[PDB]
Structure 1
Amino acid sequence: IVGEALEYVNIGLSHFLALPLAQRISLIIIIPFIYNIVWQLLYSLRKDRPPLVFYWIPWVGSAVVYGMKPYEFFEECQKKYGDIFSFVLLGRVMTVYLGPKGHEFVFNAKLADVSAEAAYAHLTTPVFGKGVIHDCPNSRLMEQKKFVKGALTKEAFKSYVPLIAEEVYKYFRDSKNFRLNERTTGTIDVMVTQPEMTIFTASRSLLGKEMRAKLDTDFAYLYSDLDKGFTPINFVFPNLPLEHYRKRDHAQKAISGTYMSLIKERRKNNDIQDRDLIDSLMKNSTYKDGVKMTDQEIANLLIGVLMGGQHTSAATSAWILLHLAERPDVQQELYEEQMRVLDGGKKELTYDLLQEMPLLNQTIKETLRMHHPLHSLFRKVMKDMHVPNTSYVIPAGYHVLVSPGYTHLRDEYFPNAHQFNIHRWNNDSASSYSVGEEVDYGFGAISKGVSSPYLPFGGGRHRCIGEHFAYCQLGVLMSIFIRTLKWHYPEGKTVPPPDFTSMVTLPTGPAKIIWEKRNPEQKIGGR
Structure 2
Amino acid sequence: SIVGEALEYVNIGLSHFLALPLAQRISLIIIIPFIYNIVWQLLYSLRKDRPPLVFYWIPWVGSAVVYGMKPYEFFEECQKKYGDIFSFVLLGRVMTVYLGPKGHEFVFNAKLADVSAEAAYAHLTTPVFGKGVIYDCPNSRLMEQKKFVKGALTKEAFKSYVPLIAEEVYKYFRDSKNFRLNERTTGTIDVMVTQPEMTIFTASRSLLGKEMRAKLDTDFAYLYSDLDKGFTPINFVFPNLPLEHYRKRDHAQKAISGTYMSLIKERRKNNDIQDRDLIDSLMKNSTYKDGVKMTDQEIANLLIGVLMGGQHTSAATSAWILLHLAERPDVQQELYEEQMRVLDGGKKELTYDLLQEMPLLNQTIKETLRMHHPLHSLFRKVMKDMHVPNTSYVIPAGYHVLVSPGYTHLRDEYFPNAHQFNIHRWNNDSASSYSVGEEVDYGFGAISKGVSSPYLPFGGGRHRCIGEHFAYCQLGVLMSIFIRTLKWHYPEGKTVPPPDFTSMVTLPTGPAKIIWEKRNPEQKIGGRHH
TM, length-normalised to structure 2 = 0.99
* Identity in percent: 100
**Alpha-carbon distance between aligned partners in 1 of 2:235 and 2:371, rounded to the nearest angstrom:** 27
Task: State the Cα distance separating 1:77 from its structure 2 match.
Answer: 0.2
Instruction: Report the equivalent of 1:114.
Output: 115
Q: CA-to-partner distance for each residue in 1:442-479, whole Å, 9 max, x for gaps?
A: 00000000000000000000000000000000000000
Task: State the Cα distance separating 1:236 from its structure 2 match.
Answer: 1.7
Secondary structure of 2:516's aligned partner? strand
Q: CA-to-partner distance for each residue in 1:51-70, whole Å, 9 max, x for gaps?
A: 00000000000000000000
Instruction: Report the equivalent of 2:511.
Output: 510
Instruction: Report the equivalent of 1:520.
Output: 521
**Alpha-carbon distance between aligned partners in 2 of 1:237 and 1:443, rounded to the nearest angstrom:** 32
Moved over 3 A (4+): none
**Alpha-carbon distance between aligned partners in 1 of 2:246 and 2:79, rounded to the nearest angstrom:** 38
How many equivalent residue pairs? Answer: 527
Task: State the Cα distance separating 1:303 from its structure 2 match.
Answer: 0.4
Can you give the 5+ residue segments of structure 2 that lack an aligned partner in the other structure?
A: none
Task: State the Cα distance separating 1:134 from its structure 2 match.
Answer: 0.7
**Alpha-carbon distance between aligned partners in 1 of 2:248 and 2:242, rounded to the nearest angstrom:** 11
Task: State the Cα distance separating 1:126 from its structure 2 match.
Answer: 1.2
**Alpha-carbon distance between aligned partners in 2 of 1:209 and 1:449, rounded to the nearest angstrom:** 39
Secondary structure of 2:459's aligned partner? coil
**Alpha-carbon distance between aligned partners in 2 of 1:224 and 1:452, rounded to the nearest angstrom:** 35
Q: CA-to-partner distance for each residue in 1:276-304, whole Å, 9 max, x for gaps?
A: 00000000000111111011110011001
Instruction: Report the equivalent of 1:196.
Output: 197
Query: Is 1:498 aligned with 2:499?
Result: yes
Deviates more, 1:325-334 or 1:244-253: 244-253
Secondary structure of 2:418's aligned partner? coil
**Alpha-carbon distance between aligned partners in 1 of 2:251 and 2:452, rounded to the nearest angstrom:** 42
Query: Is 1:303 aligned with 2:310?
Result: no
**Alpha-carbon distance between aligned partners in 1 of 2:61 and 2:229, rounded to the nearest angstrom:** 24
**Alpha-carbon distance between aligned partners in 1 of 2:157 and 2:246, rounded to the nearest angstrom:** 36
**Alpha-carbon distance between aligned partners in 2 of 1:433 and 1:270, rounded to the nearest angstrom:** 40
Q: CA-to-partner distance for each residue in 1:112-135, whole Å, 9 max, x for gaps?
A: 000000000111111111111111
Query: Is 1:446 aligned with 2:443?
Result: no
Task: State the Cα distance separating 1:6 from its structure 2 match.
Answer: 1.1
Secondary structure of 1:86's aligned partner? strand
Task: State the Cα distance separating 1:438 from its structure 2 match.
Answer: 0.4
Secondary structure of 1:165's aligned partner? helix
Task: State the Cα distance separating 1:2 from its structure 2 match.
Answer: 0.8
**Alpha-carbon distance between aligned partners in 2 of 1:218 and 1:324, rounded to the nearest angstrom:** 33
Q: CA-to-partner distance for each residue in 1:39-80, whole Å, 9 max, x for gaps?
A: 000000000000000000000000000000000000000000
Secondary structure of 1:499's aligned partner? coil
Task: State the Cα distance separating 1:328 from its structure 2 match.
Answer: 0.2
Secondary structure of 2:488's aligned partner? strand
**Alpha-carbon distance between aligned partners in 1 of 2:48 and 2:228, rounded to the nearest angstrom:** 45
**Alpha-carbon distance between aligned partners in 2 of 1:509 and 1:478, rounded to the nearest angstrom:** 21
Task: State the Cα distance separating 1:235 from its structure 2 match.
Answer: 1.7
Q: CA-to-partner distance for each residue in 1:415-462, whole Å, 9 max, x for gaps?
A: 000000000000000000110000000000000000000000000000
Q: CA-to-partner distance for each residue in 1:72-103, whole Å, 9 max, x for gaps?
A: 00000000000000000000000000000000
**Alpha-carbon distance between aligned partners in 2 of 1:243 and 1:8, rounded to the nearest angstrom:** 53
**Alpha-carbon distance between aligned partners in 2 of 1:450 and 1:315, rounded to the nearest angstrom:** 24
**Alpha-carbon distance between aligned partners in 1 of 2:236 and 2:420, rounded to the nearest angstrom:** 34
Task: State the Cα distance separating 1:240 from its structure 2 match.
Answer: 2.2
Can you give the 5+ residue segments of structure 1 that lack an aligned partner in the other structure?
A: none
Task: State the Cα distance separating 1:23 from its structure 2 match.
Answer: 0.7
Deviates more, 1:216-225 or 1:164-173: 216-225
Secondary structure of 2:120's aligned partner? helix
Instruction: Report the equivalent of 1:75.
Output: 76
Secondary structure of 2:380's aligned partner? strand
**Alpha-carbon distance between aligned partners in 2 of 1:21 and 1:308, rounded to the nearest angstrom:** 51
Task: State the Cα distance separating 1:181 from its structure 2 match.
Answer: 0.3
Task: State the Cα distance separating 1:239 from its structure 2 match.
Answer: 1.6
Task: State the Cα distance separating 1:15 from its structure 2 match.
Answer: 0.5
Cα RMSD of the aligned pairs, angstroms, is 0.5
Task: State the Cα distance separating 1:7 from its structure 2 match.
Answer: 0.9
Task: State the Cα distance separating 1:22 from its structure 2 match.
Answer: 1.0
Task: State the Cα distance separating 1:5 from its structure 2 match.
Answer: 1.3
